[PDB]
PDB file of C-alpha atoms in Angstrom:
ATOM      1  CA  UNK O   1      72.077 -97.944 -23.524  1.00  0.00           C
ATOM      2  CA  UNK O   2      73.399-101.383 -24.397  1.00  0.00           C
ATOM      3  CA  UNK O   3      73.004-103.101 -21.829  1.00  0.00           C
ATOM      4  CA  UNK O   4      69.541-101.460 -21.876  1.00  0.00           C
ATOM      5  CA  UNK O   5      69.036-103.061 -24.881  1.00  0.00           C
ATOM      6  CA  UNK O   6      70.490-106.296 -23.482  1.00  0.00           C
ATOM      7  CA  UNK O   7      68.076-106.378 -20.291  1.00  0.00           C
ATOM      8  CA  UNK O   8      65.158-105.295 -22.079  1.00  0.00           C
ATOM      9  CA  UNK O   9      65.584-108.168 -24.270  1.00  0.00           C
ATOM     10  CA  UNK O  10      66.639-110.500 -21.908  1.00  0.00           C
ATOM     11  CA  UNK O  11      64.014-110.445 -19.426  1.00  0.00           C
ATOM     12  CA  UNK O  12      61.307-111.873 -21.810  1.00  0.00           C
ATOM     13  CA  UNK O  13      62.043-115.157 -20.811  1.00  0.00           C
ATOM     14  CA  UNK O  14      61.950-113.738 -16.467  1.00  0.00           C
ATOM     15  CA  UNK O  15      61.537-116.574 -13.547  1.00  0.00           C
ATOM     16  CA  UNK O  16      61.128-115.808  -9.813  1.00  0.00           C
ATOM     17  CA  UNK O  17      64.656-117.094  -9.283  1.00  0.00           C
ATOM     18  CA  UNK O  18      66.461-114.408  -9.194  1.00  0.00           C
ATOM     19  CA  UNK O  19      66.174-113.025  -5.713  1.00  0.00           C
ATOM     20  CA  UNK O  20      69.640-112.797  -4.391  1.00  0.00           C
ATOM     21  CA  UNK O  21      71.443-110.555  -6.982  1.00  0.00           C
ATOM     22  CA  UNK O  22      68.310-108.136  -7.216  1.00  0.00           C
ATOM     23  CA  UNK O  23      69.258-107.262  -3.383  1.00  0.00           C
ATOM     24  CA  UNK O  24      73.135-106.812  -4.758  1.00  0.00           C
ATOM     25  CA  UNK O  25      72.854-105.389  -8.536  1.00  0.00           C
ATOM     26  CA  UNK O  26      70.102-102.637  -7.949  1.00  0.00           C
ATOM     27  CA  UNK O  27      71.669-101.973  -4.563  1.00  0.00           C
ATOM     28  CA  UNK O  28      74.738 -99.486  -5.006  1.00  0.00           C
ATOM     29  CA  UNK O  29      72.558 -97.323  -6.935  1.00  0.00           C
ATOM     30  CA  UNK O  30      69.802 -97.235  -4.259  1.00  0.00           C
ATOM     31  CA  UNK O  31      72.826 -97.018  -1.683  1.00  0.00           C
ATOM     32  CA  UNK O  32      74.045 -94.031  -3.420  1.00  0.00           C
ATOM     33  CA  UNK O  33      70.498 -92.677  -3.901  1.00  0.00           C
ATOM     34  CA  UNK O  34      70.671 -92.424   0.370  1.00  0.00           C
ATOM     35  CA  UNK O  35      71.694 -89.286   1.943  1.00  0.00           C
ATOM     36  CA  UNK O  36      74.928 -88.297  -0.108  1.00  0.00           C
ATOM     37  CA  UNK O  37      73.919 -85.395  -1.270  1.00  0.00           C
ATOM     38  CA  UNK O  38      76.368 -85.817  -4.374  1.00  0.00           C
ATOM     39  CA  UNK O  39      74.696 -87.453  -6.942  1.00  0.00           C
ATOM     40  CA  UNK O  40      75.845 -88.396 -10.433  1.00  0.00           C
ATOM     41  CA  UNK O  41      74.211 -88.042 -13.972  1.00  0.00           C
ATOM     42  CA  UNK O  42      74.727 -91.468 -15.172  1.00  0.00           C
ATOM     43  CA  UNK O  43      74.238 -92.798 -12.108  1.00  0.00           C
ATOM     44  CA  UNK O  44      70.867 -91.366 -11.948  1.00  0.00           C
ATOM     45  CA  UNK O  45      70.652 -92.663 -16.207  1.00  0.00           C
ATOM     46  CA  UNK O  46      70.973 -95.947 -14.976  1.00  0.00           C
ATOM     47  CA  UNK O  47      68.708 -95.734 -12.223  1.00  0.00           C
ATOM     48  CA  UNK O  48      66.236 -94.414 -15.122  1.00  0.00           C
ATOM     49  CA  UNK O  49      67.416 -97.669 -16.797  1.00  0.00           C
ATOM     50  CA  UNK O  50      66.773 -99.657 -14.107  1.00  0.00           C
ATOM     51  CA  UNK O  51      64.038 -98.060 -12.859  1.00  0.00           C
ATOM     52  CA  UNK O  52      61.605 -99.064 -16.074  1.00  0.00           C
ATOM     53  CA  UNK O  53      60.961-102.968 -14.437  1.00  0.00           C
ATOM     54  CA  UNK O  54      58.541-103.312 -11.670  1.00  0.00           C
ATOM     55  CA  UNK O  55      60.083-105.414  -8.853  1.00  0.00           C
ATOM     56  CA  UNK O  56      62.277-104.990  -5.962  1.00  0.00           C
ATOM     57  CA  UNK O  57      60.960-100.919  -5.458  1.00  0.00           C
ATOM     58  CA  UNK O  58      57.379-102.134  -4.438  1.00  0.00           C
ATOM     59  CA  UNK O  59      57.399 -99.458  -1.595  1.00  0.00           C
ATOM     60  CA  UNK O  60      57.102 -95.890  -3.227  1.00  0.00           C
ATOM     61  CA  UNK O  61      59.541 -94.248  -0.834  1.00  0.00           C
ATOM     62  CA  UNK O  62      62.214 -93.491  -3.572  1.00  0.00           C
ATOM     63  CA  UNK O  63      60.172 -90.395  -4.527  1.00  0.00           C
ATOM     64  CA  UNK O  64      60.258 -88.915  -1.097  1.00  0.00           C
ATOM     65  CA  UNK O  65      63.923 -88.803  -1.236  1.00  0.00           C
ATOM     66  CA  UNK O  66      64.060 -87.830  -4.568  1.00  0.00           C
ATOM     67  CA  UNK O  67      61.938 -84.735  -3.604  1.00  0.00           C
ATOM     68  CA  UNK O  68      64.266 -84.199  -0.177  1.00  0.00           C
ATOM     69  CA  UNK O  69      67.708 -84.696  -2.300  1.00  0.00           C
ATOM     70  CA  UNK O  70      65.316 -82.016  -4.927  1.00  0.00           C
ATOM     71  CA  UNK O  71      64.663 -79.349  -2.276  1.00  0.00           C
ATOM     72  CA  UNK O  72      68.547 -79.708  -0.778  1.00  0.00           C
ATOM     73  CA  UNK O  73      69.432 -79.383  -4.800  1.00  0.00           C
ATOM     74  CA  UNK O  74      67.482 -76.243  -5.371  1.00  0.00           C
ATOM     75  CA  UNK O  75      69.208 -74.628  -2.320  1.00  0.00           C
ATOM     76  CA  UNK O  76      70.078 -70.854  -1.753  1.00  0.00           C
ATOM     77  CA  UNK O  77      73.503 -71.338  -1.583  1.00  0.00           C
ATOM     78  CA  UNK O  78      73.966 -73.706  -4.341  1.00  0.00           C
ATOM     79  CA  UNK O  79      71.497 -71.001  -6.858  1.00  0.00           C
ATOM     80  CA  UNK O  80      73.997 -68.376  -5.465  1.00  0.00           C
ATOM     81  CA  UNK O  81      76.422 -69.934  -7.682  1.00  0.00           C
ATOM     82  CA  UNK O  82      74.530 -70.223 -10.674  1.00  0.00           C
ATOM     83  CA  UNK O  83      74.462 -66.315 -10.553  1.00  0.00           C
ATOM     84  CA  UNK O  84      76.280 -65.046 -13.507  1.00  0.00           C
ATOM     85  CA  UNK O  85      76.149 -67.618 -15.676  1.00  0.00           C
ATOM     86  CA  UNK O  86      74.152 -69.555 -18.185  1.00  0.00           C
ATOM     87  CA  UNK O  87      71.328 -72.452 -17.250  1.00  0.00           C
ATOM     88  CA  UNK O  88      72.536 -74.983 -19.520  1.00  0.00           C
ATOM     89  CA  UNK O  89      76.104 -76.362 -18.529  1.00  0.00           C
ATOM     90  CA  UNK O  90      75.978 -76.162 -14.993  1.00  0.00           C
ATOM     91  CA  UNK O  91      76.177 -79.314 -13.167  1.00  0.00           C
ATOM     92  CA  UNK O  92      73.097 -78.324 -10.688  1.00  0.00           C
ATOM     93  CA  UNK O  93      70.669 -77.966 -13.481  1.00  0.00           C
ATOM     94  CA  UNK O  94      71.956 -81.769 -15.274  1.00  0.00           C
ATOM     95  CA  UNK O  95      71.287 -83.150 -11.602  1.00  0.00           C
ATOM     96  CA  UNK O  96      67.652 -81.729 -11.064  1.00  0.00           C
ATOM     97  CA  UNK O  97      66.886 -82.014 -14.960  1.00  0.00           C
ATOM     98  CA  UNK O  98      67.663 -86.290 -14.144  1.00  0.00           C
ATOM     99  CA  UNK O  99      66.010 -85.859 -10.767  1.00  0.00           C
ATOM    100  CA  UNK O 100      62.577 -84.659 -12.582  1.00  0.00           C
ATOM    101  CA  UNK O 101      63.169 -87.351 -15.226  1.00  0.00           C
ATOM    102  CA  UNK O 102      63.163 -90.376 -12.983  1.00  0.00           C
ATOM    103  CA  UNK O 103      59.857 -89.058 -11.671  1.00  0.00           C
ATOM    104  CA  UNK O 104      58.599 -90.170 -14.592  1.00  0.00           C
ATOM    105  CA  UNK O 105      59.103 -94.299 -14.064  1.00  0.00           C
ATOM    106  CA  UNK O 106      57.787 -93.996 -10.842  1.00  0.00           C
ATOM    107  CA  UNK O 107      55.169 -97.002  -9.836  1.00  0.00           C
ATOM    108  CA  UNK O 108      51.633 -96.074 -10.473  1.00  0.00           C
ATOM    109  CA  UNK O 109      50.159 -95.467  -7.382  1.00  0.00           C
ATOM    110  CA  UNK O 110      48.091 -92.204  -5.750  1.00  0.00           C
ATOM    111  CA  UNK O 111      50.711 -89.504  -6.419  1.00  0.00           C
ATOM    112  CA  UNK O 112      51.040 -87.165  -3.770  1.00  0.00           C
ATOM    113  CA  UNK O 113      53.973 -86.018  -5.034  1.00  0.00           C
ATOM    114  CA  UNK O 114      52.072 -84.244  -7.923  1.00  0.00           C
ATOM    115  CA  UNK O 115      51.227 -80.937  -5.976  1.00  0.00           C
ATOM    116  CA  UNK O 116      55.031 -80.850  -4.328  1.00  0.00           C
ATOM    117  CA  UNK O 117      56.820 -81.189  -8.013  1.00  0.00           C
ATOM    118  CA  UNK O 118      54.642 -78.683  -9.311  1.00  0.00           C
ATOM    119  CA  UNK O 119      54.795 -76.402  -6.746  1.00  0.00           C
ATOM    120  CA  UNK O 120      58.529 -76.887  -6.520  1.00  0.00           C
ATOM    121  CA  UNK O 121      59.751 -76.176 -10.176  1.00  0.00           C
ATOM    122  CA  UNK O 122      57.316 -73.614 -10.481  1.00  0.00           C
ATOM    123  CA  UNK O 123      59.558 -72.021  -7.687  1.00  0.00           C
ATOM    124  CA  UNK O 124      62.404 -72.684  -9.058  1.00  0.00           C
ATOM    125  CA  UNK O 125      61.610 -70.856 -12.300  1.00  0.00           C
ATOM    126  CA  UNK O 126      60.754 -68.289 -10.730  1.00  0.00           C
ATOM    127  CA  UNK O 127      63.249 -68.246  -8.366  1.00  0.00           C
ATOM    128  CA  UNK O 128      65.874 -68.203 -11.247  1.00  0.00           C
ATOM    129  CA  UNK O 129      63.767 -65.455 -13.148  1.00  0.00           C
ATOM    130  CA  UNK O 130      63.109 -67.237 -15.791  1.00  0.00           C
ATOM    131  CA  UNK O 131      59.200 -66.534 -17.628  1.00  0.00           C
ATOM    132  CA  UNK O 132      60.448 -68.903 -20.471  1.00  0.00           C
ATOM    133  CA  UNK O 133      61.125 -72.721 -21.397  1.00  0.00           C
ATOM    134  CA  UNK O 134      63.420 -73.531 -18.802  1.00  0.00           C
ATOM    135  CA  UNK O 135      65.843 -76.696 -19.004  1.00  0.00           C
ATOM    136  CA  UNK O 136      63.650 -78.899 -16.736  1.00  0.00           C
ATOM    137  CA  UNK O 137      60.041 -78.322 -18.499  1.00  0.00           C
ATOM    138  CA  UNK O 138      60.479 -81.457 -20.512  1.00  0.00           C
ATOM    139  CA  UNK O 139      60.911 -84.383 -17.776  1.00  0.00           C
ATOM    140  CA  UNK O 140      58.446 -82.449 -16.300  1.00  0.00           C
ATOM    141  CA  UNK O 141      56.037 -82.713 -19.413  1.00  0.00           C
ATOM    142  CA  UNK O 142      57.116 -86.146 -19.504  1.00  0.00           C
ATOM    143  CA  UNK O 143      55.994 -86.322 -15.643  1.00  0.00           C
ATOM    144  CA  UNK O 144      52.563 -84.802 -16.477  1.00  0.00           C
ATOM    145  CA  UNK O 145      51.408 -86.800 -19.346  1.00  0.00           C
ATOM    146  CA  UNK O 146      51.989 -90.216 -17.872  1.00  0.00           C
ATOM    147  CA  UNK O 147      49.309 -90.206 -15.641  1.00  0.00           C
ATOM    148  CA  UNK O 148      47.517 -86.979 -16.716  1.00  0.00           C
ATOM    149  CA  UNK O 149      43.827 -87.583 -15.557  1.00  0.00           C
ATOM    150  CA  UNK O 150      44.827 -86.464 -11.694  1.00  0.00           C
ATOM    151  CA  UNK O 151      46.390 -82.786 -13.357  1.00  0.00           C
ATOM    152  CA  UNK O 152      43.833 -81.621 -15.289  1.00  0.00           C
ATOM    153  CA  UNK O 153      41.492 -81.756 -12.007  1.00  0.00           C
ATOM    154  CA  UNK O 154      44.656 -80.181 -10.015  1.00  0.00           C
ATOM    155  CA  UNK O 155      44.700 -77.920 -13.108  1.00  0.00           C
ATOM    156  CA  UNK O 156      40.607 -77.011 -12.945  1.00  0.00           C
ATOM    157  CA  UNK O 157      40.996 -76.258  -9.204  1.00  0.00           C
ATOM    158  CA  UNK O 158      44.023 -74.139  -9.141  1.00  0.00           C
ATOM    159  CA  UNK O 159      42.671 -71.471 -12.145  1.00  0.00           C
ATOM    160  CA  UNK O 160      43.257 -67.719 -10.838  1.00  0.00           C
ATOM    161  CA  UNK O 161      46.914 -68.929 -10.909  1.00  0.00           C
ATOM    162  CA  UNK O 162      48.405 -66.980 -13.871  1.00  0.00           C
ATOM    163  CA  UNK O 163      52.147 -68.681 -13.563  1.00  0.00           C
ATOM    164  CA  UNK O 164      50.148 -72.283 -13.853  1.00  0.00           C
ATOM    165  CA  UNK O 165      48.192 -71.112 -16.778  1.00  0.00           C
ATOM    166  CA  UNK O 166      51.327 -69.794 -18.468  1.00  0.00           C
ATOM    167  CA  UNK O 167      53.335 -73.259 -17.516  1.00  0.00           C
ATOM    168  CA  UNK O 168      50.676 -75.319 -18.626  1.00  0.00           C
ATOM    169  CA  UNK O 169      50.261 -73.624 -21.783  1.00  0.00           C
ATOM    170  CA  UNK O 170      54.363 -73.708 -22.486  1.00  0.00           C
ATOM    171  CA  UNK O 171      53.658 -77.725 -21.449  1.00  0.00           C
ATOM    172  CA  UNK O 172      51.203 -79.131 -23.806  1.00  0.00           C
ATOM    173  CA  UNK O 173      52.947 -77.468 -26.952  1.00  0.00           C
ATOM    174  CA  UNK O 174      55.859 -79.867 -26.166  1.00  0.00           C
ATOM    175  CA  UNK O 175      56.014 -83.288 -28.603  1.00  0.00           C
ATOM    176  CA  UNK O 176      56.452 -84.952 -24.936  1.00  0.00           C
ATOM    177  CA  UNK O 177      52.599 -84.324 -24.061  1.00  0.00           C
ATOM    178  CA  UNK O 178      50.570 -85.752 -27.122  1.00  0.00           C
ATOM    179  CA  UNK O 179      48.188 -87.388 -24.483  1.00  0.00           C
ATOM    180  CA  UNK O 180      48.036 -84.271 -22.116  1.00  0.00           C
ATOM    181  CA  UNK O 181      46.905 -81.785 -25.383  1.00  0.00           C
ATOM    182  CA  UNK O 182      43.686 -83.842 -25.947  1.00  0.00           C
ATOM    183  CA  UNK O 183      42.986 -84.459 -22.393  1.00  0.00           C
ATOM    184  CA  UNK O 184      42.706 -80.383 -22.347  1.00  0.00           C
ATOM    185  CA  UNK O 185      40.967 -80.413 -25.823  1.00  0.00           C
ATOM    186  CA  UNK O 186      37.647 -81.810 -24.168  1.00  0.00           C
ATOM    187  CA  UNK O 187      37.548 -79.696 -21.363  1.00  0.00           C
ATOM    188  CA  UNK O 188      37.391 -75.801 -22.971  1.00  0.00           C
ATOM    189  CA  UNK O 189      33.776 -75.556 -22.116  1.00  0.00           C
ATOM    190  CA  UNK O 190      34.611 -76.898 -18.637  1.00  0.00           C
ATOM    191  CA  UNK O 191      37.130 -73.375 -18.274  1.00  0.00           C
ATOM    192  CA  UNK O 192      34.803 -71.329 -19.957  1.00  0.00           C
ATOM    193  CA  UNK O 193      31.924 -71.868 -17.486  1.00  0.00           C
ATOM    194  CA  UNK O 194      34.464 -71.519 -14.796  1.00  0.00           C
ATOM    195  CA  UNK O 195      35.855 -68.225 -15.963  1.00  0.00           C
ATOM    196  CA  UNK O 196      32.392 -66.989 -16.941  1.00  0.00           C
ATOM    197  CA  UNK O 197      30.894 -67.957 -13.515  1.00  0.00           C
ATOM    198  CA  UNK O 198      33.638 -66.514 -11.330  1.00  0.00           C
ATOM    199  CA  UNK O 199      34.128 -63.438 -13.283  1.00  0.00           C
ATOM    200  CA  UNK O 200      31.979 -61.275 -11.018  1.00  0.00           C
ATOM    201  CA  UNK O 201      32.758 -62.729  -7.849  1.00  0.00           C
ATOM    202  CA  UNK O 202      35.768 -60.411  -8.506  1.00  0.00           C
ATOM    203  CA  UNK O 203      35.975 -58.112 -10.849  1.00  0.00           C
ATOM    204  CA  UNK O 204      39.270 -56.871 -10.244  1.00  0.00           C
ATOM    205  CA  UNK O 205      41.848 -59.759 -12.018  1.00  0.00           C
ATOM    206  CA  UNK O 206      39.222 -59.676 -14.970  1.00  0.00           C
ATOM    207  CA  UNK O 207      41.892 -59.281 -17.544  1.00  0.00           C
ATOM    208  CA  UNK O 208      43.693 -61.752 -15.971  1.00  0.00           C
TER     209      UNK O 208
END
């Protein structure tokens, strides 16, 4: 955090001349981002840390194996041995809880990993039979309201969903989504027509 401080006050005054120690400061992190499988906490912290400038990851290919180091995180075998006990103090869950948060300072470009993360800690929860806040709904709230104009179309396609409804509505309660709550605010009449309009097309997940 201090030397946090120390960079983000630092590079104020920035100049195109560093080049060379960009390709050897930033580059034992991104080394040890590589297929490892073994990960660290602070490691992953001060790639966070790191990760809030906007040079030298230009090419958005660190979130493709972020979500392949995800998927080999939120194994079968590895969930076998978070059987038993709690969700909170387990190493696995601190790993994908920073994994989800450095989604967050990702560059701005068309995220196609918005459908994959969703999709992926949705299973997750469910996979670990949990219908309540869960320790990685909070970088993912973080995730969401960032950019938050792509999910609430993702959001007004994908209705009939009842674990997306539930998630989303667990989501925008959080302190971490101030933008997301009155981006859904505006659109009530949108889901209203839509619910009212594709009630009898069904007729059977009416209560739903």
């Amino acid at each position: 955090n201090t030397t946090y401080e120390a960079l983000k006050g630092s590079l104020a005054e920035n100049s195109k001349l560093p080049k060379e120690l960009l390709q050897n400061g930033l580059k034992p992190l991104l080394m040890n981002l590589s297929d490892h499988q073994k990960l660290t906490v602070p490691g992953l912290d001060a790639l966070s840390k790191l990760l809030e400038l906007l040079i030298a990851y230009f090419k958005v290919e660190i979130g493709r194996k972020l979500l392949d180091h995800l998927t080999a995180w939120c194994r079968v075998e590895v969930l076998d041995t978070l059987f038993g006990q709690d969700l909170a103090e387990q190493m696995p869950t601190k790993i994908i809880v920073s994994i989800i948060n450095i989604f967050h300072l990702l560059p701005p470009q068309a995220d196609m990993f918005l459908n994959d993360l969703l999709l992926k800690v949705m299973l997750l929860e469910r996979k670990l039979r949990l219908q309540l806040d869960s320790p990685f709904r909070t970088p993912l709230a973080r995730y969401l309201n960032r950019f938050h104009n792509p999910v609430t179309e993702y959001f007004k396609k994908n209705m009939t969903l009842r674990q997306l409804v539930l998630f989303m509505c667990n989501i925008v309660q959080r302190p971490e989504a101030k933008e997301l709550a009155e981006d859904f605010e505006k659109e009530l009449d949108n889901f209203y027509d839509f619910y009212i309009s594709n009630i009898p097309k069904n007729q059977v997940r009416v209560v739903s």
